Amino acid sequence: RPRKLPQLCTELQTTIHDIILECVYCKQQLLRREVYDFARRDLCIVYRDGNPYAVCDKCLKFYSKISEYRHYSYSLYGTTLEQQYNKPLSDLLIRCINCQKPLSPEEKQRHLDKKQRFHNIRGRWTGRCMSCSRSS
């Protein structure tokens, strides 16, 4: 089963512009904007009853907030994360806590310089991307 939207498209003989996707949680159709955002955030297609699903913004924000408030935990500096996984920060998946987008290599190297820690939530490591760090 394809885990990423392009392969799912290259398997239902469609494109990201055309594909019809439903939210795994609420089963409502994703807006086209939500489909593009799903791919740019490098999210994973999930399968239930053998059918592919994505996620809408409302449910992603809803269950994200639950998981943060109901699975609070600890934080580490990047060098310790590097030691713990042996890989460089650029090789680790670290998402923005707010928009769920994968952090860029620059954003991760920025965390290191500013002595800012990454945060663990249910085994997922998070930071904050430059875009969400520059908003009204």
Binding site: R3, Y25, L60, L93, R124
Partner: protein, 383 residues
């Protein structure tokens, strides 16, 4: 305040024999000088992870084993390491209920399963099938009574019927639970819950019936049957109802499948009294004399201690308890169990009240039971 060094504070649910347990605590104090305080707070199973996460709470928490994996995953429970000699005093399957990631995380106390409890004067021959109940109720209502009342607010009590024709929580294979395979909204689950909703629609039960209403009706002799566990028997005794305890009715020819709980005692990871707690639990509670003291207050069911269970097993009520247990399944202890219960609780209540169709209620519950794990997949690291 911080947990007090040099005494034991115990939390246990209000439907269990907490006065009997306090008697074991008095024996401990008489022998050792260590005071034992037994409390039964509201919602203790929700309070424990909150107060223990800040280093406070009881020294010992009692609950069915299904809550304990979540506690252990949060680092709130001390690892249990009884000697091999003590381990051999308890049934092996009860240790398995309290084993999480290969470590023992609580002491097992007793095995609980729901049975059909029936009024022998009203109903000498209890029904073998769920499908008989509506006609049986029509019959009993003509006598000024009713056939069956049991708690519809807690999914524990309705799960045996939901599971009978194929419902399950998480698929179990190779000694392991797959949280990707949840069985809350499959055809068997829908069939069982639809039968329950039809009982209510056809005026054989009321969606609002809870533990207290059902207990009062059965013990006042107003209804011929209830569904409940061993903790309920001593109130029936004092009500003077002539009752039997028997196998749950079948649904579509399949046995009802109760979720079996092992009442278990965990030690708070923050307790400064872990050594005393182990001495109390191993050498005072988990003895013939200690379990008898609790059992005399509210019956425990089939206890984990072999030497005492061989006496209890001669009780036909205990035999029926374990017959129903053997047809059901031992609850998972994984952290996902609480989300599963909260999800099914809403589904049964919403379906019973007609706020949702059976299909919509269970479809929502299938999702909620695995919401966190679905999020993990969405945000995970794949292709």
């Amino acid at each position: 305040m911080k947990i007090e060094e040099g005494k034991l504070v115990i939390w246990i649910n209000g439907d269990k024999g907490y006065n009997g347990l306090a008697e074991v605590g008095k024996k401990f104090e008489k022998d050792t000088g260590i005071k034992v305080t037994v409390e039964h707070p509201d919602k203790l199973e929700e309070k424990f992870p909150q107060v223990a996460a800040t280093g406070d709470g009881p020294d010992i928490i009692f609950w069915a084993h299904d809550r304990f994996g979540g506690y252990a995953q949060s680092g709130l429970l001390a690892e249990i390491t009884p000697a091999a000699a003590f381990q051999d005093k308890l049934y092996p399957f009860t240790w398995d209920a309290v084993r999480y990631n290969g470590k023992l995380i609580a002491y097992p106390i007793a095995v609980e399963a729901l049975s059909l409890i029936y009024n022998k004067d009203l109903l000498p021959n209890p029904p073998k099938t769920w499908e008989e109940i509506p006609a049986l109720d029509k019959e009993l209502k003509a006598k000024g009574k009713s056939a069956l009342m049991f708690n519809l607010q807690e999914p524990y009590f309705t799960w045996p019927l939901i599971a009978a024709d194929g419902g399950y929580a998480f698929k179990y294979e190779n000694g392991k639970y797959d949280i990707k395979d949840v069985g809350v909204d499959n055809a068997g689950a829908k069939a069982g819950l639809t039968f329950l909703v039809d009982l209510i629609k056809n005026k054989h039960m009321n969606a609002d019936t809870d533990y207290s209403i059902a207990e009062a009706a059965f013990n006042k002799g107003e209804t011929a049957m209830t569904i409940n566990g061993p903790w309920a028997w001593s109130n029936i005794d004092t009500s003077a109802v002539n009752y039997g305890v028997t196998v749950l009715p079948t649904f579509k020819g399949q046995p009802s499948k109760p979720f079996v709980g092992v009442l278990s005692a965990g030690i708070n990871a923050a307790s400064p009294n872990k050594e005393l707690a182990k001495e109390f639990l191993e050498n005072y509670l988990l003895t013939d004399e200690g379990l008898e003291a609790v059992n005399k207050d509210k019956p425990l069911g089939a206890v984990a201690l072999k030497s005492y269970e061989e006496e209890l097993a001669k009780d036909p009520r205990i035999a029926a308890t374990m017959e129903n247990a053997q047809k059901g399944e031992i609850m998972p202890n994984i952290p996902q169990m609480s989300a599963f219960w909260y999800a099914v609780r809403t589904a049964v209540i919403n379906a019973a009240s007609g706020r949702q169709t059976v299909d919509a209620a269970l479809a929502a519950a299938q999702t909620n039971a695995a919401a966190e794990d679905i999020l993990d997949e969405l945000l995970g690291e794949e292709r």
